[PDB]
From a paper:
Ubiquitinated substrates are first recognized by the 19-subunit proteasome regulatory particle (RP), then translocated through a channel into the proteasome core particle (CP) to be degraded. The proteasome activates Ubp6, whereas Ubp6 inhibits the proteasome through deubiquitination and a noncatalytic effect.
The S164R T166K double mutant (hereafter rpt1-RK), which has lost ~97% of its capacity to activate Ubp6, was chosen for further analysis. Rpt1-RK proteasomes appeared to be inherently unable to activate Ubp6, and not simply attenuated in Ubp6-proteasome affinity, as the catalytic defect could not be overcome by adding elevated levels of Ubp6 to the reaction. The Rpt1-RK mutant proteasome was indistinguishable from wild-type when tested in a degradation assay with Ubn-NCB1 as substrate and no Ubp6 present, exemplifying the specific nature of this mutant. Thus, the Rpt1 mutation impairs the Ubp6-dependent transition of the proteasome to the si state, although Ubp6-UbVS remains docked at Rpt1 in the s2 state proteasomes that are observed with the mutant. Release of the proteasome from the si state may account for the recovery of protein degradation by the mutant. In summary, a modest perturbation of Rpt1-ILR contact interface can decisively alter the conformational profile of the proteasome as a whole.
Numbering used by the authors:
A (entry chain H): 105 to 108, 144 to 156
B (entry chain L): 89 to 350
C (entry chain J): 52 to 152
D (entry chain N): 541 to 675
E (entry chain S): 459 to 492
F (entry chain K): 73 to 286
G (entry chain U): 1 to 290
H (entry chain V): 18 to 306
Amino acid sequence: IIKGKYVINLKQIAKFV
Amino acid sequence: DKTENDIKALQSIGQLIGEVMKELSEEKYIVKASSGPRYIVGVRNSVDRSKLKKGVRVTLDITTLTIMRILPRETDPLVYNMTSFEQGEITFDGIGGLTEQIRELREVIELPLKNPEIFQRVGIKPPKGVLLYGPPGTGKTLLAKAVAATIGANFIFSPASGIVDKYIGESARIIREMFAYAKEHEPCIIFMDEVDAIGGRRFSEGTSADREIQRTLMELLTQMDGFDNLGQTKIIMATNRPDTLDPALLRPGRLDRKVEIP
Amino acid sequence: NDKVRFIKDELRLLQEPGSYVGEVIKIVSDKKVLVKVQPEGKYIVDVAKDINVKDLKASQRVCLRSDSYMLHKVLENKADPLVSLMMVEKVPDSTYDMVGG
Amino acid sequence: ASDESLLRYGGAFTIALAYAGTGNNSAVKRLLHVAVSDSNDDVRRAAVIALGFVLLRDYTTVPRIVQLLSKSHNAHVRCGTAFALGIACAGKGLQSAIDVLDPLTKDPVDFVRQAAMIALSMILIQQTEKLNPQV
Amino acid sequence: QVFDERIKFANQLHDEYLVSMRYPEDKKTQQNEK
Amino acid sequence: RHLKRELKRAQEEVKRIQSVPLVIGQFLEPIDQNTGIVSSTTGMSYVVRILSTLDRELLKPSMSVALHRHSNALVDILPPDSDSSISVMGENEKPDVTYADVGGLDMQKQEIREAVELPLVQADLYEQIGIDPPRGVLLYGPPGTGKTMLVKAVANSTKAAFIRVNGSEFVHKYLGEGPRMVRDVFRLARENAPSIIFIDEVDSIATKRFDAQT
Amino acid sequence: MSLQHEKVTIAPLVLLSALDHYERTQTKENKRCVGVILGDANSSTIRVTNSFALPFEEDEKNSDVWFLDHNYIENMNEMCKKINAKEKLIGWYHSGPKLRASDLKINELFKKYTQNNPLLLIVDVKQQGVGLPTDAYVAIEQVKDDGTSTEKTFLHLPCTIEAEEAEEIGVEHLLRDVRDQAAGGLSIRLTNQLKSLKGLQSKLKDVVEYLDKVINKELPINHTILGKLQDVFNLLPNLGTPDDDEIDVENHDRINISNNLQKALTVKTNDELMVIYISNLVRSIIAFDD
Amino acid sequence: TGRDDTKETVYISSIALLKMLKHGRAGVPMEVMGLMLGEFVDDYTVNVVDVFAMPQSGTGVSVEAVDDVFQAKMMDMLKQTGRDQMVVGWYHSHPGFGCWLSSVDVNTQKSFEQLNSRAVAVVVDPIQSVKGKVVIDAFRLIDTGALINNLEPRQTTSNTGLLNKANIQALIHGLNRHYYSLNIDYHKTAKETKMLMNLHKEQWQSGLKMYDYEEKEESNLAATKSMVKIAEQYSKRIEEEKELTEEELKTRYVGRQDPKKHLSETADETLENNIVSVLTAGVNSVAIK
Amino acid sequence: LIETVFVKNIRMLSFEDISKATHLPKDNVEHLVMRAISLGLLKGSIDQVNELVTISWVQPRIISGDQITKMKDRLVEWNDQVEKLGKKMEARGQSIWV
Amino acid sequence: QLPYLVANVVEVMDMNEIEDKENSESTTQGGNVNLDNTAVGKAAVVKTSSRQTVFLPMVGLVDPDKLKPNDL
Ligand SMILES: Nc1ncnc2c1ncn2[C@@H]1O[C@H](COP(=O)(O)OP(=O)(O)OP(=O)(O)O)[C@@H](O)[C@H]1O
Ligand SMILES: Nc1ncnc2c1ncn2[C@@H]1O[C@H](COP(=O)(O)OP(=O)(O)OP(=O)(O)O)[C@@H](O)[C@H]1O
Ligand SMILES: [Mg+2]
Ligand SMILES: [Mg+2]
């Protein structure tokens, strides 16, 4: 959690914002 | 200007790395891309045949697949951490009263560094290979930091367990490629810190982790002795008990001096 | 003419979408086949008009047209698992004239 | 001599209608030239069709001329071959005309098949099947 | 000059075969067969 | 005349599909002389048409090959020499140890001159007597004994081709990488036969026990 | 500024573009068209990627009087900068039949925008000649040995054409022709041979009558023109030398391979000769049962 | 009804095709966009004269990525020189997919169709034009309400009936059943044909350009050596191969992988090259001196 | 020395012609030639056994009214020479100009 | 604005900056005058979590002070 977007890492390992 | 350089950047596309695996004809090359599958690619007149040679990282295009230009070699992201942690620094003297062992260590390391020519006169193989073992807390590591600090020779390092990876053929990759680094960087000194991780024996009647150790261990032997021979790459191996290890990591001429600090 | 119109025809023939090797795990009697693609996983997929599930059987390799994985032909191959073990061990057979005495 | 596809398409048929039903080598000669030597498909087709009009007066020789053209596997060339045979050998049939069209009926290209079925019916027009089994 | 006289013998053989090769083939395909 | 002309044009077209870029697969085995089974090294198996007027004498046994990128067809073939795992390490490298390190280890010296050197100098010595040749050599013992030293020593002596491979040069890094590396090294050996293939260690590669639950 | 214009590669896109703009202003009867040239510089090869028309009205009373919109130029450039940001002013194309000395003053005007030396690319819209419809020139300053001060003058640049991989295949898609200048098969290189020789014969005829015009009709004398002819005479081949005798010997060698290969194909065809005749015998049996 | 009501056959000029490809190729892998400028005559003849690209985005092709500023202003540039016409449609690039409209672009085509109902969308593959063949296809939406009214046969009336396909099951569904395809032809004048056909000023004078003789001796040497080995291959083939069933014999006694054909091919090839080499040398010696 | 080679269509000179022009012995013709090479005003090599100076390269220099006429005639000879020869090449290979 | 890939930096291995007359690179190339012809500015190699590496020209707004040879 980035305070005022988020970082997810998928199960397809592949990281996106 | 700050935003106009970004326009020039956004309209540029990326490039995909490979390396020259094999010359095919004159204009055709086998590359092994870092995507992984090999391709056949072209040349611009920017490169020449004699600037290409095997094992050179070359760029490719991603829609033309032509070598535009030669690139210097890849270098792991991991190993820059190791070249930028030496802190905990201290002078020639890192202990007092065990100076006799400090003097002994530099015999193996520091002396062939300065003059190979005095080991010519004798006719021995230039010394290399060091095992450090002893009771814990006795400055075996602080001496490691001191001989990287004092001489200032190129140092890497490896914690016993930050070279261990989940992917296999990836924990081989680092340490193979770490020795490579050691041959372009001058007189290098490889400190293995607190190795008991891959110190393990043949086991593999236990879990799969014991074959993971095995895979990584075989990798070392071929480097230590073979057609690949060292001379200005030195091993300092730090451990807290040496009878954990496999005896092929107790093997002299890879470990020529076994210095104990009591 | 036979020559030049064979080249011109081969240019079309060579253009594919990709055509795979699959192997039949098992059929289902909806007129579909469960096929495990050898690298990939399993997909139940229909069959062509030149084959049906009675022409198909477990452990027989098929050809797939891979945009839906629509069965094209049986393959000209068939795997056998018992030979896998026997070969990898690798032992011959004999007569009694190689044991005599 | 026009490089337009359009004016060359009609160019063939001005020879055809100018020399229609005339036993002239030059009239026929020109059409043969266009078919082979031109690299636009529609223009290749038009040259073949035109042949039957010049050689209405004598259509005995016609199937042999286009025998060559049916060997060629371009859809348009075979397509215009079908029509030339229908045109020239209409009325009471000719055995050679029938033969050349048969492979063109079974062609793997729809455009040649559509042309061929029609051409046959002109050759065999209102012929009873008790007078010829092939009909 | 020597090579050319040899090439002319080679060219003579090239003409001779071309003419005669198809000629028995054309009569034989004329004549009926299965 | 016009067909001879469009034959040229058609042959020109088919060279364009022979050309770059190309992806490299592996040929498994045929099912036809114009259709084959290939495993791309993308980790995908394909059944692909084959181009006519290629040679197939080297193709039908496993060998590197060129396939086209987007369509994935067999459009050209490669020679087995190129696309090696690693090139010869006995002509572009030279052993760094000779038999002047060898004093003793004579017991093994009588057994290794039989095993390695005699089929290199002439294979037919065995055949005429009627002795069939021995196969590979296993050296075992603690590695401090000079097992490899002996390999370098007689390699420098016989001066035949030599290949330096290891299991960390066969090791998997992506899908389908490892098996491919295996096939290449023998292919090269046979091409410039006779040859010696040296794998320094097979400890990792082979293990008496396996899990095979993972 | 500098000379880096040694090669000018020109995209085929630009030539096609030039004719399109020329007609869509419909400049005829000795009217001109000028548009900007966009592309790379600071490279020995000058890459002509793109062009765009500028509004430019050229007078008919004089050649010294023209209208050109300076404000227009920046707007066209900033837009195209958004598309691809490797495009800058590298010159301007003139579309006249040939070269003028009122283009020199225009050249100076475009020197303001450039950071290179302006390329004048006379794109011919008359398609004259079987060779390139492009001559290229760059305006350069010289002094000369005559006593002439501070000249500005145009030095010819050899013209070449390159195309990108995507660009080239578009041509191939559009066209299917086989090209009277092609060096393909045996009949095609035979035609190229006689065509190439007569190409030289034409140019040499011009020089001979050009020399007369200097020395009876008082065309100007220039040391660049005389110096080039000197080079021809000095590096001219010679026969009857030991070079000539080795040529003849190399010549027998090539005649030797030809003679071997002529014999080789007679064997193959004579094999076919037999096999047609065996097939006849078999088909006779078949015909008799039939 | 009352018109031909069929999708234009898009005639893309000599300039345009190249321009779209150059535009798209640079941006690979990211998607590209732009407008087609053209003119509309017959009920089914749109000649596309020129193109211009609409600048890049950080989210690729969107309806959002249309910017009225760029579009109108760039139009006003052409206006001053009188080479603008009217927007006949737009192009965009899917280099990661085959020729067919993605989910987004259909809604973009909807908006474009509102403005002008002859609006086409042309999908360019700059990544499958590394072949000798350029992969390019044209589509125009047929509305959903239009499929309900079953007006689809109206759009195929008075055509040759020849349409294009691209891969099966997902690509082909969208193709025939939600939009309509018409072929693409290429338009040119005889002035432009001469411009393309020309090459260097020493390309019609390249037959006097002999080569180094070291290279020509390489050619002489390689051919003669290789043919000895294929001849050996040819000897083995004709020892047997005289029992029954031709294909069998050809499989048994290598007759497939035909050395008879290969040998003749090489001989002819080297034979044609050497007659011109001899001819070149005989000219240049005697003609120059 | 530079003058005599350039104006002539021959590029080989017996020392006898040079000796009589420059009023030198054979000793000094050999130096003169050698110096021309060192400075780079001529380049070539010497046969003192054939007794020729075979010059192979002449420096370009200013070209005056008289020389242009010499230069011109040389170009007429070669121009006519291609033209007569091209007729044979038109006549030979008539069948194929395709 | 979203979405974008998240990666780490292999290394910054810069090329010399663009002010020169012959190339602006650290690795010698064939041929002469070049400044943007195949020449490029500073270089960043980044490794994805889709598992490759790409040689990209680094953005001219992001500094080498904002880049470490491990930076995320
Ligand atoms: N002889 C010494 N004199 C002063 N400080 C020392 C001495 N040796 C060790 N230390 C201190 O102890 C700390 C940790 O010991 P260090 O990591 O260097 O030793 P070690 O013998 O390898 O054992 P381990 O690896 O288990 O830590 C140092 O950072 C330092 O402050
Ligand atoms: N008989 C001998 N003469 C001289 N030196 C020897 C002798 N035997 C061994 N040595 C030396 O001992 C070292 C090891 O030998 P070698 O290089 O053959 O590896 P190895 O035993 O197979 O080890 P590993 O396979 O684990 O890598 C070498 O430096 C070698 O020269
Ligand atoms: Mg420690
Ligand atoms: Mg060893």
